[PDB]
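Query structure, 1762 tokens:
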């Protein structure tokens, strides 16, 4: 305890040397003394004598503390409420003036707010009308009678202006009617009313900003009302009449009082003469209180705090009398023979007080209100009054104690005898304090926070309308209850309180708790003690309290004019209401509520002629760009900057006011859009600890909490070794001026190593040294070299490390994930809201660690242990920030830098570049200041060409120079503070942004003074501070508004599909999906399968929500095209491992971040029953929802997948993200198709998690009560995914019409990009300049992919070879043999295309086969080493593809069970085709090509000649050989080779069906017969030697590359060398095969077989004819229609840029009904009647009489065709 002992000695020494101990410093020193004494007490080894000594010292300190008291000022303050009749005021004022002789009475009057009641009434009318309109137009399933009656009575008034009371009475009856409305409608009414009122207040404050006002008065309010509505002269006359009435009333009252009591005894004080009214921290909450209040006859709750803080003394309510003197109460009790009933019940007390007040003011005693009082009580009260009147006037009342402890506000305590018992609570109607009291500041801060939290319903864009919180008297201002109270007050005209006595008591309790040991006497059982009040009464050992000799003297509050009499006795005033018709609302002047596009026809309607002719043309140049910016689902900051700058210039260049207001409205719309469009946050947290504390338990707890909150969150622990060395050196220099080195290095390394090895098993925890990622020339590295030690080095390190691409959350504190709503609910079963915060550390300790605390019940611990940790903590995932890219924590409404939240990777980050440049500028100023070479001129040069020059004012330059002279060495934060005058860099971010965003940035800065949140402040906080567990958000409470947990779909450790084998799932089911959809009545089926997500973790929730967002067909098409583009990009990046251009990578990252965020949000919403309704699968119920309840969107949830049902226009579209979509005419058809699809197919059923399960209880439908819930839940910033078509680099480069000269040959830029032209290590995105051509390099992987995907012409191949030879492969990528680059003629392009397609299909199939084999081998217990050595490839079943394998693992393990029909079925088809083809001439070119490629791959494997992966691949090759041997070797010849038999079969096929197809077959067979080409063998060996070993990819990609090499070897045989200068013109067309027509099939159909088999043959012919209608090769400008057989009357129009294809498809026909494409399978069945209506769908003839070949007319890709 040496350090703390030194602390107590030092603090006592400081206290003794105090000239005036009666001050705040002395109290703080005594508090420190008491706290340190308690710390000493806390030690375990303390003797009893030490206990006594500590207790005695503490008691002496407390006695010294409470001896510091202050005498309050001799001021009595009262607030005059507008409309108060002076008759009921002057009596109480006279009584208080008489009792308190040495006091001055001040009546606080606000002359500028005499008419505010009518203004707020008009605003309330507008808000309620808007709420009613929104409710009515949003719910079209039914009409609401309450709204109709409301509108009817308002229309009735619109005829009768004189009958105000009639309208109020009708409104009361209408509230009686309204009480019967449904609960969801009531909640929506409350929310909409409160939100609209807040928005209207925001609009008024924006009007104040644009008018540049400094004070708010009645004229400004009248002008604003004229601005928003049509104000006739009668309304202005009424407003002036009430203003003048209030003026006359207050003047008469004050004059009559001054005549009697003098001039200096009582006076009038102006409310506007208060500094708190204009304070920026108060956010003009005084003006907001005028609107959001429901206790109108009472005085303001903030005004009394302001008055007490700035003046001190006594604040008293008007309706209060001083407490009776001792003699008075003694007479009362002994004229009632000891009946206490005359001092406790309210009626008799009120009568006695009435009589006393009447007597003191020389009035008639007999006129006392004796109603609801028994006659005997009346007579005894009369006797009491007669006795009292005998007393002298100087002994009726007694004064109060004006000596109070320093920094305290005594609060009147009230005793009321209720039928249930005694009601005791504090009142803010009478308070005491001295000027400058600290508790008043605490209460003011609490009131400001209360208003901040009340505005959360409007400020939070993602705020949920439907949330029925239980009544718990929470500190949070529950918006639903407040809205309900406001609605009731608005309708009826007559608990909760944001800034009332409850908040005051809570704030004082918190203040006294923060005082420490000296405040323990003010706290009684975590509640304010009796010492904090006045008027407290001690009980005489009974239920009643001894009124005689009160502990403190209070005040008489039971009076004839108190709260309980003006509800009915005083009728509702008529000068606090002004009827107004809202139909004349000027919606163009209300940007907060209505989003209005600029319409050139009506925009300049009220403008002057001069301003119109000056600037209407200039404005009209903005309309298209401005509307595009407003309607966009993304933000392009270039357009925003341009539009904002030119709007600001136009506003500056104007002299009109209406035009200025319209342009200001445009700016306000821009600001609101910026507020609404938040962007996601990366699931990363970066913690910057200080390696100087001696507890890592906080850091370990933080890391454990973030690990447990989510299984995908990455945690980075960042430290700087150079900074530690610099701190060590500075400490050494300080020690010397006033073995260590190795010891310090060892200690730092030991701390770092302990942190590293605590989380060694978690790969998500990475401990990084900052002096490894920063560059050499960056500012941070220079600071490290200079020995920068200032405390802000960690903040600059955070900014720099974010600037280097490290995204996520950057903080220095040991943050913890915020508790979820489930944990708070669990804790709420035993604790209330003020104990939960204290119990949270123990709950966290039990959840993360396993520590059990004796201070928490075991039931709570058992409940906590039953839930997963990620259900109790909130992860970083799902968070969002402002589109400016930077977000900051807040503290009492001021942004701090404890937490920095920095956007998502791939999104625009405007603030980051500004911060980087600003840090450069600060470093330059710092280095000039170090050497003393800084003057005004050098400073101007330093800040020139920098946005930071906006801070260069004369006074700022002078301050910078003065500080440079005073102290040449200062921190960058100090330099920034001197230059800007702002506390933190986060404050300077908006000032820097306002340089490029004038007007909008200025407006966003200005709105902070009016309660609006800072644009860079985060509102919802998913973190809490470790030491007190409070949130870091702006307007959030982590206890009363904890977020809901998100459902995490746990997936198997093995996935059925990888990215390579994923398309197999779509290929196996696309045909069945289309057939079922068409047979259930779908008329438009589109296929857009997704390849973004190959695992079912998340259940495709992100894509489902993305599709759910769209409400239009056009937006749906845009989003579908964008998603297809992103899927292609993801396949290129991840499956093929190819580099992407910067823009493509940014687009992919943006899409993936949005998808992850949306998936988290959707899995959160589906489990929250208060947000989205959830019902089990029932077709009737869903049909009723979509037809009767007005549901337009729904989510169909299976255990593993999510589907979407929509109501786009007049159709119902069902979207399966893996299969595109199909739309129907009625919901019932869609539901039937959903059920049939998910239930009939076994593989799809198993994949979707519905195998062997009742689908009626495992399919849930999630919908919303109203449609606006989706608008509230789904983000508005879509990154343009649903509003504009995103273009890849290829699409942009295709538009350039100029060629690039490389190697003496000119080729387009798109082709140069396609072959992988990389410039300085990045793929080119623009045409390189002539000097950059020599530096161009070709990416080998990209070139290989391009060659495998493209069919070149011989000249194109020559050009590619020349470019390759003259430029070369970029180092580290795949080398390309120039002999492999060849081209083919026109007639063989279709064959090459089909061969490449077959290569892709075979690769995708063999990937899954290999994965199955690998899993099969992995389920075998293998000992140390790799002895699997499978030694048999016997196959048992042919129809199923069963193989029996002998395993020579050495322990006699044997598992002969594998299912591989992919290999066997292909050879079976080849064999049956080879054998039966002489009779049936129909052949399959693709099947033959696939077989040739497969056998070539097997041969190349065999020439190869030992872990699980390669053993499984060799097993697959052996199985291929075995299947070929079984299905092609009819006789068991030992000397049989598969290649020769395959080649001979295809040679026979080729020679028997001629044409170009036979030529291609013969070429492939010839390739098979000859030995493997030397180039092919070289490529294979080089790959298997270096390329496979160097890369870290898995084995499936290697096997796919080997298959691709084999298929390329096959493709090489179809190429032809280029011929130069052909002497003669030759023929270049394909040659037809023998038997093109349908007579060939009819030749074998005539054989007497089953008729349905003959139809199957005909259908096979039709399908083959329609499969290849067109083969397009836009790269070589070739269109191929040779494969068209069943598309008649073809018309090709090449005039359009994408060629237009028209024609007639072949169709089915029926004898009776003909061809009916418009009917489904069931409708056709009913039409022709070939079965029963209850027959299963499998028993019908699918596609009968409604089929077409092809299904849809093929679309030709855009290109240049010749």
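Result returned for the query:
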């Amino acid at each position: 305890y040496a350090n703390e002992i030194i602390e107590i000695k030092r603090i006592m020494g400081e206290y003794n040397l105090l000239p005036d101990k009666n001050s705040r410093n002395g109290l703080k020193l005594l508090q420190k003394q008491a706290d340190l004494l308690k710390i000493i007490m806390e030690d375990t080894s303390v003797t009893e004598n030490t206990f006594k000594n500590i207790e005695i010292a503490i008691t002496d300190i407390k006695r010294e503390y409470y001896s510091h008291t202050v005498d309050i000022e001799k001021n009595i303050h009262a607030i005059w409420v507008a409309g108060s009749p002076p008759e009921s005021i002057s009596d109480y004022i006279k009584t208080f003036l008489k009792t308190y002789k040495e006091f001055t009475y001040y009546l606080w009057v606000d002359e500028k707010a005499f008419g505010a009641a009518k203004f707020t009434s008009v605003l309330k009318q507008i808000a309620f009308d808007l709420a009613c309109r929104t409710i009515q137009q949003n719910t079209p399933q039914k009409n609401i009678d309450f709204i109709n009656l409301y509108n009817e009575i308002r229309k009735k008034y619109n005829n009768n202006p004189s009958g105000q009371q009639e309208y109020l009475n009708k409104l009361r009856e209408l509230y009686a009617t309204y009480q019967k409305i449904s609960t969801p409608l009531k909640h929506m009414f409350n929310s909409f009313f409160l939100e609209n009122m807040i928005k209207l207040q925001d609009n008024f404050f924006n009007y104040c900003i644009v008018k540049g006002v400094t004070e708010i008065n009645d004229e400004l309010r009248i002008n604003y009302l004229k601005n928003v509505i049509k104000l006739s002269d009668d309304d202005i006359g009424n407003y002036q009449k009430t203003i003048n009435d209030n003026k006359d009333r207050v003047k008469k009252l004050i004059l009559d009082l001054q005549k009697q009591f003098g001039e200096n005894r009582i006076s009038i004080k102006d409310v506007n003469s208060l500094t708190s009214l204009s304070k920026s921290e108060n956010n003009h909450n005084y003006q907001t209180e005028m609107l959001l209040r429901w206790n109108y006859p009472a005085a303001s709750d903030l005004l009394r705090m302001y008055i007490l803080k700035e003046h001190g003394g006594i604040y008293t309510d008007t309706d209060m009398m001083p407490a009776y003197s001792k003699q008075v109460i003694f007479k009362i009790m002994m004229q009632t023979n000891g009946d206490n009933r005359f001092l406790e019940d309210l009626k008799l007390r009120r009568a006695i007080s009435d009589g006393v007040l009447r007597y003191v003011n020389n009035q008639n005693i007999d006129e006392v209100n004796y109603n609801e009082i028994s006659d005997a009580d009346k007579n005894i009260i009369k006797k009491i009054l007669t006795e009292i009147s005998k007393m002298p006037e100087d002994s009726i009342f007694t004064k109060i104690n004006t000596r109070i402890p320093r920094d305290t506000m005594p609060i009147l305590r009230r005793y009321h005898l209720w039928p249930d018992g005694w009601n005791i609570r504090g009142l803010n109607g009478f308070m005491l304090s001295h000027k400058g009291s600290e508790v008043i500041d605490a209460v003011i801060a609490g009131q400001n926070q209360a208003y901040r939290e009340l505005r959360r319903i409007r400020d939070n864009i993602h705020s949920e309308i439907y949330f029925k919180q239980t009544d718990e008297l929470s500190s949070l201002p529950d918006t639903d209850k407040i809205g309900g109270i406001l609605v009731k007050k608005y309708l009826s005209g007559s608990t909760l309180q944001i800034s009332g006595p409850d908040l005051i008591q809570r704030k004082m309790l918190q203040f006294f708790r923060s005082r420490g040991v000296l405040g323990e006497e003010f706290i009684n059982e975590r509640k304010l003690s009796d010492k904090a009040y006045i008027g407290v009464y001690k009980t005489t050992g009974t239920g009643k309290y001894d009124w005689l000799t009160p502990e403190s003297i209070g005040v008489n509050d039971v009076t004839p004019a108190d709260e309980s009499t003006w509800c009915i006795g005083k009728g509702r005033c008529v000068d606090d209401f002004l009827f107004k018709d809202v139909s004349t609302l000027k919606t163009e002047n209300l940007p907060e509520l209505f989003l209005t596009k600029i319409d050139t026809d009506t925009f300049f309607s009220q403008w002057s002629t001069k301003t119109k002719k000056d600037l209407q043309k200039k404005i009209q140049d903005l309309t298209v760009r401005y509307n595009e910016l407003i309607d966009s689902s993304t933000i392009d900051f270039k357009n925003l900057y341009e539009i904002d700058q030119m709007l600001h210039m136009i506003m500056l260049e104007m002299n009109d006011d209406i035009a200025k207001r319209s342009l200001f409205s445009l700016q306000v719309q821009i600001a609101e859009k910026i507020r609404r469009m938040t962007i996601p946050v990366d699931n990363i947290i970066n913690i910057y600890p200080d390696l100087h504390k001696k507890n890592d338990n906080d850091l370990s707890m933080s890391i454990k909490g973030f690990l447990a909150s989510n299984p995908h969150t990455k945690i980075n622990i960042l430290y700087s070794n150079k900074t530690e060395h610099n701190i060590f050196i500075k400490d050494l220099f300080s020690f010397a001026v006033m073995a260590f080195f190795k010891k310090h290095n060892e200690n730092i390394h030991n701390k770092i190593q302990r942190i590293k090895d605590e989380f060694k098993e978690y790969s998500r925890v990475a401990i990084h040294n900052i002096d490894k990622v920063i560059f050499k020339g960056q500012t941070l590295d220079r600071l490290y070299h200079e020995g920068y030690v200032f405390s802000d080095i960690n903040t600059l390190s955070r900014y720099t490390l974010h600037g280097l691409g490290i995204t996520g959350v950057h903080t220095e504190e040991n943050l913890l994930p915020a508790p979820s709503s489930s944990l708070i609910n669990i804790l709420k079963e035993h604790y209330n809201e003020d104990e939960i915060s204290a119990k949270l550390p123990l709950a966290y300790d039990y959840i993360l660690n396993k520590k059990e605390s004796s201070s928490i019940p075991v039931e709570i611990l058992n409940k906590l242990s039953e839930l997963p940790p990620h259900e109790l903590l909130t992860p970083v995932l799902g968070q969002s920030v402002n589109p400016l890219g930077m977000g900051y924590s807040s503290d009492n409404g001021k942004i701090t830098e404890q937490v920095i939240v920095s956007g998502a990777d791939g999104f625009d980050n405007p603030i980051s570049g500004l911060i980087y440049t600003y840090l450069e500028d600060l470093y330059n100023i710092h280095v000039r200041m170090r050497e003393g070479t800084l003057n005004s001129q050098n400073l101007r040069q330093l800040l020139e060409n920098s946005v930071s020059s906006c801070f260069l004012t004369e006074q700022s330059i002078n301050k910078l120079l003065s500080e440079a002279e005073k102290r040449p060495y200062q921190s960058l934060t100090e330099i920034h503070q001197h230059l800007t005058g702002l506390p933190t860099i986060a404050d300077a971010t908006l000032s820097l942004l306002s340089v490029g965003l004038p007007g909008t940035g200025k407006l966003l800065r200005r709105e902070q003074d009016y309660g609006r949140p800072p644009v860079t402040a985060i509102q919802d906080s998913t973190f809490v501070l470790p030491y007190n567990f409070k949130g870091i958000g702006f307007n959030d409470n982590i206890i009363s508004s904890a977020p809901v947990a998100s459902s995490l779909h746990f997936i198997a450790e093995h996935a059925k599909y990888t990215l390579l084998s994923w398309p197999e799932f779509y290929r196996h089911h696309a045909q069945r999906w289309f057939e079922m959809a068409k047979g259930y009545g779908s008329q438009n089926i589109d296929f857009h399968p997704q390849s973004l997500l190959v695992t079912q973790e998340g259940r495709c929730m992100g894509l489902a929500l993305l599709y759910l967002q769209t409400e239009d067909t056009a937006h749906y098409s845009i989003l579908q095209e964008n998603l297809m583009t992103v899927s292609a990009l993801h396949q290129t990046s991840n499956r093929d491992k190819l580099p992407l251009s910067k823009d493509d990578n940014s687009l992919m990252t943006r899409t993936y971040s949005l998808i992850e965020m949306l998936q988290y949000q959707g899995n959160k919403y589906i489990t929250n029953e208060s947000l989205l309704h959830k019902t089990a699968w029932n077709q009737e119920r869903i049909t009723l929802l979509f037809n009767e309840k007005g549901v337009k969107r729904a989510l169909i949830s299976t255990p593993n997948h999510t589907l979407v049902l929509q109501q786009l226009e007049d159709i119902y579209r069902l979207t399966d993200p893996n299969f595109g979509h199909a739309d129907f005419l009625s919901p019932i058809d869609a539901l039937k198709f959903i059920e049939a699809m998910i239930q009939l197919t076994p593989t799809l059923q198993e994949y979707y998690g519905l195998l062997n399960k009742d689908i009626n209880k495992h399919i849930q439908v999630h919908y919303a009560e109203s449609d606006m819930v989706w608008n509230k839940l789904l983000p508005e910033n879509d990154a343009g995914l649903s509003t504009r078509i995103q273009h890849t680099t290829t699409d942009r480069l295709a538009n350039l019409a100029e060629p690039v000269a490389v190697a003496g040959i000119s080729l387009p830029v798109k082709t140069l990009y396609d072959i992988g032209a990389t410039l300085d290590g990045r793929r080119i995105t623009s045409p390189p300049t002539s000097e950059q051509i020599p530096s161009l390099r070709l990416n080998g992987d990209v070139l290989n992919d391009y060659l495998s995907r493209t069919v070149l012409t011989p000249e194109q191949a020559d050009n590619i070879r020349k470019i390759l030879h003259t430029q070369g492969i970029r180092s580290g990528t795949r080398p390309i043999d120039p002999e492999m680059i060849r081209g083919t003629q026109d007639d063989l392009v279709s064959s090459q295309t089909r061969l490449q397609r077959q290569a892709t299909r075979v690769k995708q199939q063999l990937a899954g086969v290999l994965d199955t084999l690998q899993q099969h081998f992995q389920n075998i217990p293998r000992s140390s080493g790799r002895h699997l050595s499978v030694e048999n490839i016997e196959l048992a079943d042919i129809g199923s593809g069963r193989f029996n394998l002998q395993i020579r693992d050495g322990e006699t393990l044997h598992t002969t069970s594998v299912e591989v029909p992919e290999v066997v079925s292909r050879f079976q088809k080849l064999s049956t085709m080879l054998s039966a083809l002489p009779a049936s001439g129909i052949m399959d070119f693709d099947l033959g090509m696939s077989v040739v490629g497969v056998v070539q791959y097997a041969r190349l494997l065999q020439q190869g000649h030992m872990d699980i992966k390669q053993l499984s691949e060799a097993t697959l090759g052996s199985m291929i050989q075995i299947a070929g041997n079984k299905f092609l070797n009819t006789e068991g010849i030992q000397g049989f080779r598969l290649e020769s038999a395959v080649a001979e079969g295809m040679r026979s096929v080729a020679t028997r069906t001629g044409g170009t197809m036979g030529k291609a077959l013969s070429a492939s067979a010839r390739v098979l017969e000859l030995p493997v080409l030397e180039t092919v063998l070289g490529t294979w060996n080089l790959y298997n030697s270096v390329i496979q070993l160097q890369q870290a990819t898995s084995y499936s990609e290697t096997m796919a590359a080997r298959v691709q090499i084999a298929f390329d070897s096959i493709s090489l045989g179809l190429t032809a060398a280029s011929v130069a200068f052909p002497p003669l013109i030759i023929a270049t067309g394909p040659i037809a095969a023998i038997g093109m027509g349908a007579s060939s099939i009819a030749r074998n159909v005539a054989r007497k077989e089953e008729r349905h088999t003959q139809w199957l043959e005909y259908k096979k012919f039709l399908t083959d004819g329609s499969k290849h209608i067109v083969v397009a090769s836009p790269e070589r400008g070739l269109l191929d229609f040779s494969g068209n057989k069943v598309f008649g009357k073809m018309v090709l129009d090449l005039r359009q840029s994408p060629p237009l294809l028209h024609g007639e498809s072949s169709f089915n026909a029926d004898r009776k009904i003909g061809h009916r494409p418009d009917l489904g399978d069931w409708q056709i069945r009913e039409k022709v009647g070939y079965a029963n209506s209850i027959s299963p769908y499998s028993s019908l003839a699918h596609g009968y009489a409604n089929s077409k070949w092809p299904r849809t007319i093929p679309k030709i890709p855009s290109g240049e065709y010749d």
